[PDB]
């Protein structure tokens with residue numbers, strides 16, 4: 001109904017710092033969280049009349065992780081490689097999710 005897709009990417013930001021381990025010394029991986037917004041966003045995408053895939057967004061995140069990476073100086077390339085893995089499963093189930101809803 002409104003910038004609902006925007007608030008969704010804001011939640012991912014809270015998860016982005018968590019996987020980069022900023023203030024919390026240890027952290028667990030939450031694939032479900034990323035997968036969640038993944039299908040919910042796919043819906044809004046169909047109502048936005050645009051392709052499910054969207055690199056630009058992925059490119060924007062690349063610059064976002066680099067900034068937090070230097071901040072907590074936890075790592076560099078290793079951190080970026082992990083995020084890409086989260087996006088892969090995000091796109092994969094995104095298309096399968098929208099396709100499974102069209103069947104019903």
Ligand SMILES: O=C(O)[C@@H]1C[C@]2(C(=O)O)C=C[C@@H](O)[C@@H](C2)O1
Nearest residue numbers: 041053054055057058087090091
């Ligand atoms: O458009 C979207 O909002 C969703 C989420 C996504 C992500 O996982 O952050 C970011 C951008 C798009 O490539 C995909 C993956 O769909």
